[PDB]
Amino acid sequence: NSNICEVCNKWGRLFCCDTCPRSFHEHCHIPSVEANKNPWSCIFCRIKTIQERCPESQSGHQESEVLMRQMLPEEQLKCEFLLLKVYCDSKSCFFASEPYYNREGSQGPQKPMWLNKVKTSLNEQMYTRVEGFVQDMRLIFHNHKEFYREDKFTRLGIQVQDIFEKNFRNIFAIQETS
Ligand SMILES: [Zn+2]
Ligand SMILES: [Zn+2]
Ligand SMILES: [Zn+2]
């Protein structure tokens, strides 16, 4: 197994996957690494299994169809993995905790959003459809773009949104287009 956490790339108290060489801090894994379970399989392995069990799940999908899916166990897991993929980028630190807004010439968003709030919402099963999760994720970056206006810091929002959107298209097998 790896000697650093797959998500934050630091050593520490790590839990090892039994079916692949990845390792995780307890609360870096999503969901948090389970108390017992021997063997234990990580979220990467659990997602791979879903695909292997239903090869046709990788055929192209319409985003509109994906968004209306109810959050049954498999869709719950996929949103958890997509969240984890965002945390895997070091630039997610800017969007992780609750923001505050006091900049000359800007006003804060009407509905603030951040990754830890989405993490909690997933953990507490507050989303009934994929759309709920995706809307809050996209709101994070849209709030950032609107607030930081012409400051070059706006680009961090563009960058992390691109990681989100690429991983969304991959995980939910969205039909490729030009
Ligand atoms: Zn970690
Ligand atoms: Zn694994
Ligand atoms: Zn099948």
Side-chain angles (χ1 to χ4, degrees), residues 1-36 38-178:
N1 289 71
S2 183
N3 306 337
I4 60 176
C5 178
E6 186 82 357
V7 182
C8 73
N9 303 105
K10 298 292 191 283
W11 180 72
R13 180 57 195 112
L14 301 170
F15 301 87
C16 285
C17 182
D18 289 312
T19 51
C20 78
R22 298 174 172 98
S23 306
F24 305 82
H25 297 102
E26 174 162 13
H27 297 308
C28 284
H29 196 272
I30 306 179
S32 296
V33 169
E34 297 75 10
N36 206 283
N38 322 60
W40 179 74
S41 268
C42 80
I43 189 162
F44 294 79
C45 287
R46 295 166 67 192
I47 292 285
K48 181 205 303 307
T49 296
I50 305 315
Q51 290 169 14
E52 288 178 345
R53 290 179 160 159
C54 287
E56 68 270 33
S57 72
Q58 305 159 279
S59 295
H61 300 82
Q62 297 298 110
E63 176 175 314
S64 62
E65 177 271 320
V66 168
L67 293 185
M68 293 310 303
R69 294 174 191 174
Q70 296 180 11
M71 291 282 254
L72 294 183
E74 287 185 4
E75 303 317 301
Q76 177 76 30
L77 193 75
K78 288 183 172 202
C79 289
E80 292 162 349
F81 188 51
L82 173 51
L83 183 57
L84 175 138
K85 287 289 193 145
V86 173
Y87 282 100
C88 290
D89 197 283
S90 65
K91 295 157 175 283
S92 69
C93 67
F94 297 112
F95 301 106
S97 74
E98 183 176 0
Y100 61 87
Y101 297 97
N102 194 3
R103 183 195 188 235
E104 189 181 323
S106 290
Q107 267 293 328
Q110 305 296 311
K111 186 177 168 185
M113 194 46 63
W114 58 101
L115 297 170
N116 299 344
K117 188 177 168 61
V118 181
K119 185 181 279 204
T120 293
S121 298
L122 275 171
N123 178 245
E124 290 177 4
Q125 299 158 308
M126 300 288 298
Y127 302 112
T128 58
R129 288 172 200 273
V130 172
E131 183 176 50
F133 167 79
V134 177
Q135 287 171 344
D136 280 351
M137 295 291 288
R138 285 173 170 168
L139 180 65
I140 298 172
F141 312 115
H142 191 251
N143 284 351
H144 179 99
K145 289 162 89 165
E146 296 306 299
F147 184 73
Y148 290 108
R149 305 288 202 107
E150 311 301 287
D151 195 295
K152 63 193 174 172
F153 191 59
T154 59
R155 177 161 176 263
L156 273 295
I158 296 170
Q159 291 175 325
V160 184
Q161 181 158 19
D162 192 49
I163 297 298
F164 175 70
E165 290 299 337
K166 284 177 190 280
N167 281 281
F168 174 70
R169 288 190 306 266
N170 181 259
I171 290 163
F172 287 95
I174 298 292
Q175 180 52 57
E176 289 273 287
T177 58
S178 55

